[PDB]
Amino acid sequence: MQGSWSVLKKNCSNFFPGLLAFAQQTQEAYGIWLRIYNRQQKYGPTDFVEQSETFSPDYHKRFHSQDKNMWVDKELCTEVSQKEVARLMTYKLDMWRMAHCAGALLATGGYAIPFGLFWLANDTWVPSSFNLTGEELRAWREAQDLYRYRSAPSYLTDTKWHFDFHAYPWNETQERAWDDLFEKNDVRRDPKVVRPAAEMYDGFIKFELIRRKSLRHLCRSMNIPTF
Amino acid sequence: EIQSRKKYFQTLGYLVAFIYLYFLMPKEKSFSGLSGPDGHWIMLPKGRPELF
Amino acid sequence: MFLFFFCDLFWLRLLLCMYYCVWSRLCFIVYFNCLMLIFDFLLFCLFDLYLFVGLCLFLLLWFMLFNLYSLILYYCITYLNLYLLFCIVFLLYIAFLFLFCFLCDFFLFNNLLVGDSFMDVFFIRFLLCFLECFSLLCRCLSTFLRLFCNLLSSHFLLLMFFDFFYFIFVFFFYGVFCYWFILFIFVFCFCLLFYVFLYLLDLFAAILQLFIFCNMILQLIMDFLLFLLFV
Amino acid sequence: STVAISVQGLHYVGTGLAAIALAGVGLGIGTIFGNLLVACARQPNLTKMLFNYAILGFALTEAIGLFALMLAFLMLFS
Amino acid sequence: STVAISVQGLHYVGTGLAAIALAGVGLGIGTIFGNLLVACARQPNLTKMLFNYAILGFALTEAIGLFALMLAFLMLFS
Amino acid sequence: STVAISVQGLHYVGTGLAAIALAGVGLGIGTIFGNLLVACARQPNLTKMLFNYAILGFALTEAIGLFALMLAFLMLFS
Amino acid sequence: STVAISVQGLHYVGTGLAAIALAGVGLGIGTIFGNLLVACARQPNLTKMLFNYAILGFALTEAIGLFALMLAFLMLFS
Amino acid sequence: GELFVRPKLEEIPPADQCRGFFGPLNDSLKFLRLLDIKWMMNRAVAMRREYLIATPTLFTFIWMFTWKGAVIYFWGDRAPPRRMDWNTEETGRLPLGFKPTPAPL
Amino acid sequence: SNPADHFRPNLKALTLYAERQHYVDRWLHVKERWLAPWYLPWWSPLFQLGTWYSQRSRNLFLVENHLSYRPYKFRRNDEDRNNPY
Amino acid sequence: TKYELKMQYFDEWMIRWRKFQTESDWEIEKGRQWWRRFNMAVSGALFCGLVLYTSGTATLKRQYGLPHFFDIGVDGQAKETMLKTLTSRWRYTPQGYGRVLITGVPTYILFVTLEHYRERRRMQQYLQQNTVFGEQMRRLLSTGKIEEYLPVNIKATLPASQQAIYNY
Amino acid sequence: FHFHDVSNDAIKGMPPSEALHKHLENAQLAHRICLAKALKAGEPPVEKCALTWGEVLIRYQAWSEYRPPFQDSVAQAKYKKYWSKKRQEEDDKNPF
Amino acid sequence: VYTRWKCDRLPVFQLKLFTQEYPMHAAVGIFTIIFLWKHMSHCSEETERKYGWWAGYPYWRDPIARRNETKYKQMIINNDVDITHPKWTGCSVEQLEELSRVV
Ligand SMILES: CCCCCCCCCCCCCCCCCC(=O)OC[C@H](COP(=O)([O-])OCC(O)COP(=O)([O-])OC[C@@H](COC(=O)CCCCCCCCCCCCCCCCC)OC(=O)CCCCCCCCCCCCCCCCC)OC(=O)CCCCCCCCCCCCCCCCC
Ligand SMILES: CCCCCCCCCCCCCCCCCC(=O)OC[C@H](COP(=O)([O-])OCC(O)COP(=O)([O-])OC[C@@H](COC(=O)CCCCCCCCCCCCCCCCC)OC(=O)CCCCCCCCCCCCCCCCC)OC(=O)CCCCCCCCCCCCCCCCC
Ligand SMILES: CCCCCCCCCCCCCCCCCC(=O)OC[C@H](COP(=O)([O-])OCC(O)COP(=O)([O-])OC[C@@H](COC(=O)CCCCCCCCCCCCCCCCC)OC(=O)CCCCCCCCCCCCCCCCC)OC(=O)CCCCCCCCCCCCCCCCC
Ligand SMILES: CCCCCCCCCCCCCCCCCC(=O)OC[C@H](COP(=O)([O-])OCC(O)COP(=O)([O-])OC[C@@H](COC(=O)CCCCCCCCCCCCCCCCC)OC(=O)CCCCCCCCCCCCCCCCC)OC(=O)CCCCCCCCCCCCCCCCC
Ligand SMILES: CCCCCCCCCCCCCCCCCC(=O)OC[C@H](COP(=O)([O-])OCC(O)COP(=O)([O-])OC[C@@H](COC(=O)CCCCCCCCCCCCCCCCC)OC(=O)CCCCCCCCCCCCCCCCC)OC(=O)CCCCCCCCCCCCCCCCC
Ligand SMILES: CCCCCCCCCCCCCCCCCC(=O)OC[C@H](COP(=O)([O-])OCC(O)COP(=O)([O-])OC[C@@H](COC(=O)CCCCCCCCCCCCCCCCC)OC(=O)CCCCCCCCCCCCCCCCC)OC(=O)CCCCCCCCCCCCCCCCC
Ligand SMILES: CCCCCCCCCCCCO[C@@H]1O[C@H](CO)[C@@H](O[C@H]2O[C@H](CO)[C@@H](O)[C@H](O)[C@H]2O)[C@H](O)[C@H]1O
């Protein structure tokens, strides 16, 4: 979404209330994350807690492994509720963007003010707390969805083109899953037909071998700041 | 459409530049001094008596 | 000292604007090997091995606009300087080398230590590693030197031969009306043949040198590429 | 006593020496084509491919001769 | 008596002599490609692998010429 | 002291050296034809394609000899 | 100081060097006839076409020899 | 060329098997392993840690080909002359009777 | 000589000269002007980027104690090998 | 206070008029260089310590575990001691931007603070000098401008064989 | 007045500081001579003495930049290390 | 759909190209530019006379001297420099007047 004067006025008016709400959310999310981290450290598997190293087979560069470095706490409901988890995720996004902005401010002193004016003129990188009414929240969500639309096709095309140019599926079912995986949203994709693509790509590329450009595209599509 | 207009203007500018360069612009530092500049200094201090 | 000058491509820039305001397909490329690095299927690389395509195409375009058109008399190769070519090759080669080094994978350099465990490490293998590390920089220097020297020598020879041809054509054409016309005709035919041969040779050599210039960079890149197999 | 002498004509001698480098290059090029003929008669189906490799070798070998020729011009024109 | 003389055109001679080393480099390159052309016709299926080794020799053969070329400049420009 | 000397007859010396560059060129040409005969004798049906390549090799080798010959005549007239 | 010297025995030295190139020609002749015999033995039916091609090779190689020989005689009498 | 796999802990030969410049630096000579460069090279090769030999070399070349080469060329100290112009340590001092300005306060 | 003269750029238009001292001083003035305001604390990465490397280089120059003589960078004549002055 | 903006002009002038550099000023600059090296060393030590503290448990086990390159015995003892010391207590082992911040921000802050205060110290030292450089520094801090050709204006000391210029 | 000899032969066996000071003195002498001529003619000095002033300026810049090295432990160590007895004998033997 | 080359304007695409596509090359180029302007941006008057002119230095008018004369005149006039100061001349003003009366 392009910046505008109306959004600039909206964000300037709600700047300090937004900061206060962000601080309150920060306290709440710190509590939630403290609970979750204590539970992970206490009941987590040895590999997950010790941060086992998984290196690539070509350049031996460490990256997170989906099987070992990711763990699902099946018994987290006892300590943390679903709503708390959703709140933590939203706060993580908002805190990421706020941290990048604060880093820019600290780095450039008082010279970031015009860049701050550019920032407040667009809802793409402002926290959700800056919206105090339903219409403002709707506009903010629209901006986020616009950014997702802008970013996702590049990631999908990167993945599909690389795989198709450097590899082909083994069997017919894998072919069907691969072809139907990248259909447009106007048609409904059957998850059962599409699932084998997961194993096929695990054969091709895992999350531990994800390239940096593809990662940048994915982070763009997840509204995660990249600079 | 955009590129056609931009390239039309670029072509006119490059045509003018080519004409000026290859038919009007004199070469610097001529032996006779009849054409072109011999160079000069810039960024000279001004209003700084303490500098000397 | 600040000198203001211009390249000799303004007319060619005008032609590019005129003839490429609309799209056109490209099917013939001087260095096609930058697009097809992998020839065995199911092999793939996690490194950005296709990053050099754009630079390769732009360099080919620039050097072709300069060198090929330089055969036209009085056309100037504005970039024809030894240290400028050194700067260009330094940029490209060192940028790719630092891309490989910033990866912080020291095992990538294991192949520098040439030979097997049977060979003495200190007196054979270490010396070979030293020589290879030196040979990388020597390859860069050789690339830029070759590119410079080929053009310089070709154009020197062309200028000298053209001067000789002008001299004989102007100051000895009257021999056509004289009794020694046959000698002049033979000399003139030989000069025409040499003219054609030199032009063909230069045309071919320019393209070939550009091919080699890009191939050296691609070889640098390939020397550190590792291919995984799909399963 | 300190005497400094500058002989002009020496540049001719150095120029002629560099030309000797062409003897190896000219011979080297002929070697490539000799193998090319003796290879095309052993596998004519690849004549076009071999001709391509022969030309590449000719340029690399020729490139060296230019290096020497450049030095000849430098000294001959200085 | 002690007499010191400085002949100022001798660096041309040394430069030409160093340039002569390029004849061997050119000849060696021609030999490599001559063997390549006569070897591909024998085992065409491995043509590509041979070409890689041929270039390697050129990379390790052209480098020597650079040293001789390097000396030429160090004496031509001094 | 500053002494400038101009030796005239040196141009004869440099010219003779460039003539030596034709030794490899003449040898290289002879090598091509010698290989041509073997290829023709071992593959008599290709008496024209081989002949064309032999001519091409001779032209390139002749070109190298002519580059040197230009210096040989140029210095002789300098 | 400006000193001009004219040595009248250096038109001999250049002449001798130009004669050296003949060796590269004379050896080239033997190579063509060295391989002609082998080709004749391999394919006696082509004793004629090979002989003509060998004559062409010898003449072209001799052409290089006479180009060098011209420089040899010019500097001998000048 | 091909992919590199680090050796397992059981595939690494013992340190005592490594050889130095003259011979193995076994018991009563272990502390000499630190000083013997060839022994360290052989140990690294045995442990497949060849990069320790190659990485310092290449980088060094780069460091000379990029930054130190020009630094030496443009700012390096050449050989000193025979007759040396040492400093008399007389310059710089203020003259007698000069009234220096007061320091900030 | 004449053939060598054919390898020069053919479209030279203007040449400008400037002393190193003058433009270095002007650059220092600009840097001070932009780094002076209070809203850029000295501990900011921007300020350190601006100042620290220059300070280090100048200190290295001052500390230099070379036994040889380095001729002035901007002499009138630097082509005579036997006259460093 | 921003001492670098004031000191850059003084450093450039000293480089331009380095002839009048007394041995005291040379010692001052050598001490500044030594303190810069010391600050670099301490900042690097802090960075290494922070990196080691935040390192993952498996990473520490791999780094400070078998095999031993030398196998002298002291190497293994030291590695085991360090590994036990690190793995005994609980350590915050962040990854990504968090580790970057933790390892860098303290190091940058320490280095910058030390360098800034050493620059202030050098300014004070040059203020206390009784040479032409000290007078130039004091005049710069007073009037705010660098007075070039000062040494010849106030006739700073010269070698006995070069006092003819002052002969007026 | 008398100009110092700053020719290559004289400069060869001279310390850098002495040569720089001699150049500066020669520049000052030339500048004052030109100024005296201008005053005698009565014409403005700026319109006649500009080039001499610039020469004095450049000589001043060259002269003030050079600081002779201090004789200390490391400098003396370097000088003695390079100038060994063998090197001194070789230098004495060399006629150049 | 969105593409950098087709949707973004030229400056934005330039920044993106040289920051997220070829950043290392840009860094090396800037380094080399700085080196060239720090060590290869000076030309002495003798060098200009030898090689700085297309057909040769026209000594019959010495444009370098005129250029330096204009430079020094401008500097003196703008900065209000007293070229008669003893430091410039090496002698007092009275000695200068005595010399003027002598010559
Ligand atoms: C004054 C000096 C200044 C120096 C110069 C600085 C120049 C600017 C550089 C940037 C500095 C930081 C800027 C502020 C960031 C905000 C704080 C923060 O870390 O946010 C968390 C967040 C962590 O990100 P993450 O990816 O989630 O972390 C993954 C970890 O696994 C996360 O671990 P986890 O999964 O276990 O989750 C933990 C999480 C769990 O907690 C929660 O979930 C609760 C929320 C906690 C975080 C809240 C953040 C709020 C941010 C917004 C603040 C308000 C802004 C208001 C703006 C408007 C004001 C008017 O809690 C954390 O986030 C803890 C992270 C670790 C702490 C990092 C801080 C270390 C530095 C501070 C101490 C310094 C001591 C100095 C001692 C000196 C001794 C001599 O920070 C970021 O978003 C990362 C920064 C993004 C910008 C990067 C820019 C480049 C940086 C390069 C630095 C290189 C070194 C320095 C030299 C530079 C030279 C060029
Ligand atoms: C009070 C507030 C609260 C407190 C403060 C809070 C904190 C605030 C700060 C933090 C805020 C963060 C978020 C910011 C978001 C907005 C960012 C932004 O700018 O968005 C684009 C923003 C528009 O954004 P938008 O419309 O919302 O669209 C956003 C889309 O989502 C499009 O999105 P996109 O992603 O496609 O766009 C991204 C685009 C962003 O970029 C752009 O879009 C380009 C913006 C500039 C375009 C300029 C075009 C016009 C040029 C005009 C030229 C002059 C004309 C003639 C003038 C004549 C005047 C008389 O590309 C990039 O991100 C590239 C990044 C490049 C990074 C560069 C890093 C360099 C590193 C160097 C290498 C180091 C290596 C290591 C070395 C180590 C050595 C030891 O651009 C503008 O608004 C354009 C402004 C143009 C101003 C006028 C022209 C310049 C005037 C200069 C005046 C100079 C005066 C002094 C002169 C002195 C002379 C001596
Ligand atoms: C036709 C001609 C037209 C005109 C052409 C003009 C001439 C251009 C010629 C040359 C162009 C190419 C130059 C390339 C250089 C080499 C680049 C390189 O090696 O990059 C590697 C690498 C590539 O970056 P990347 O992160 O991989 O991705 C870059 C993509 O563009 C990221 O893209 P993305 O899509 O992934 O993310 C999009 C989005 C994602 O959204 C976000 O990330 C959220 C928002 C983030 C806000 C920023 C957070 C920053 C956090 C702290 C960063 C570390 C600070 C370090 C300490 C400070 C050092 C100063 O991010 C943004 O929207 C970024 C907005 C940035 C706006 C500013 C862009 C520059 C405009 C000019 C302003 C400055 C003018 C100064 C000169 C004039 C003065 C009078 O760079 C970095 O790692 C970034 C380091 C950044 C360090 C800070 C900047 C250092 C440079 C000096 C700053 C001086 C400031 C002066 C202030 C005023 C003083 C008076
Ligand atoms: C003191 C005397 C004056 C001089 C002062 C200089 C101050 C210097 C300061 C110190 C600088 C130190 C460093 C210098 C390093 C130099 C290195 C160098 O030269 O490298 C060679 C290198 C050569 O590159 P190249 O490969 O030849 O390509 C560059 C070309 O520009 C072509 O590249 P391109 O085609 O890729 O470029 C993009 C091109 C894309 O193509 C086009 O846009 C086509 C047009 C091309 C124009 C540019 C070519 C110029 C051709 C020659 C001149 C044309 C005729 C001029 C007539 C003058 C008559 C006196 O677009 C443009 O050029 C954009 C500008 C378009 C302007 C259009 C204006 C329209 C006005 C319409 C008005 C209508 C009014 C109606 C009123 C009605 C009332 C009723 O130069 C450069 O790369 C650029 C160097 C520039 C460095 C910065 C210099 C500072 C800025 C000075 C501006 C002075 C303005 C005031 C002048 C006033 C008249 C006297
Ligand atoms: C990750 C990247 C991968 C990709 C790489 C891509 C590139 C290719 C690679 C090759 C590089 C290509 C070059 C590209 C251009 C880059 C720029 C450049 O070349 O600039 C050079 C450029 C050269 O300087 P320059 O401008 O030519 O001026 C020369 C002057 O010397 C300047 O004067 P200054 O005042 O600046 O001082 C400089 C000073 C720099 O040094 C210092 O300032 C002091 C030391 C700093 C240490 C830093 C921290 C190290 C760690 C501390 C401890 C940690 C552990 C703590 C816990 C311990 C527990 C027990 O050095 C010296 O002057 C020499 C002093 C040496 C004293 C030796 C005294 C004797 C005793 C010690 C040695 C012998 C020990 C024998 C033991 C025997 C036992 C049996 O800059 C410098 O080198 C100096 C400034 C930067 C210093 C950075 C210091 C940190 C370096 C990194 C250390 C960590 C990484 C390495 C190890 C990694 C292991 C995995
Ligand atoms: C204006 C500001 C200017 C700033 C200038 C300073 C530089 C820029 C500042 C920072 C800029 C922001 C971005 C930085 C890069 C971020 C990289 C990143 O994303 O890391 C993520 C990563 C987090 O991911 P993770 O999953 O948690 O862990 C990584 C995985 O392990 C990854 O797993 P893996 O599988 O990849 O494992 C491999 C990994 C393992 O490494 C790691 O990741 C561990 C952390 C690094 C350890 C480094 C120390 C190693 C030991 C050194 C021992 C030295 C002993 C010397 C003794 C000398 C005695 C005399 O990488 C390596 O193996 C690389 C090792 C390093 C090799 C260094 C080679 C240097 C060659 C030098 C050549 C010659 C130079 C010239 C000549 C000099 C001498 C004359 O971050 C880190 O691990 C640490 C980040 C630290 C960031 C840098 C902090 C900067 C602090 C600056 C303070 C000083 C300021 C001075 C200012 C001056 C005035 C302006
Ligand atoms: C967080 C750390 C804070 C540290 C605060 C201060 C700690 C106490 C003082 C530390 C010691 C200081 O003592 C320091 O000694 C060294 C010599 O070894 C001196 O250095 C002196 O001799 C060395 C000898 O090589 C020279 O290189 C140097 O140029 C010279 O100045 C320093 O001028 C002095 O400051």
Curated annotation (Swiss-Prot), chain C:
How does it sit in the bilayer?
Multi-pass membrane protein
The question of whether Transmembrane helix is a record keyword is answered with yes
The portions of this protein that span the membrane are: 25-45, 46-66, 84-104, 118-138, 144-164, 178-201, 208-230
Q: Does the keyword Membrane belong to this entry?
A: yes
Encoding gene per record: ATP6
Predominant localisation class: mitochondrion
Q: Could you tell me the keywords of this UniProt record? A: ATP synthesis, CF(0), Hydrogen ion transport, Ion transport, Membrane, Mitochondrion, Mitochondrion inner membrane, Transmembrane, Transmembrane helix, Transport
Role according to the record: Mitochondrial membrane ATP synthase (F(1)F(0) ATP synthase or Complex V) produces ATP from ADP in the presence of a proton gradient across the membrane which is generated by electron transport complexes of the respiratory chain. F-type ATPases consist of two structural domains, F(1) - containing the extramembraneous catalytic core and F(0) - containing the membrane proton channel, linked together by a central stalk and a peripheral stalk. During catalysis, ATP synthesis in the catalytic domain of F(1) is coupled via a rotary mechanism of the central stalk subunits to proton translocation.
Compartments, record wording: Mitochondrion inner membrane
Tell me which Gene Ontology terms the entry assigns under biological process.
ATP biosynthetic process; proton transmembrane transport
Name the record gives this protein: ATP synthase subunit a
Assigned GO CC terms: mitochondrial inner membrane; proton-transporting ATP synthase complex
Query: How does it associate, per the subunit comment?
Result: F-type ATPases have 2 components, CF(1) - the catalytic core - and CF(0) - the membrane proton channel. CF(1) has five subunits: alpha(3), beta(3), gamma(1), delta(1), epsilon(1). CF(0) has three main subunits: a, b and c.
- Family assignment from sequence similarity: Belongs to the ATPase A chain family.
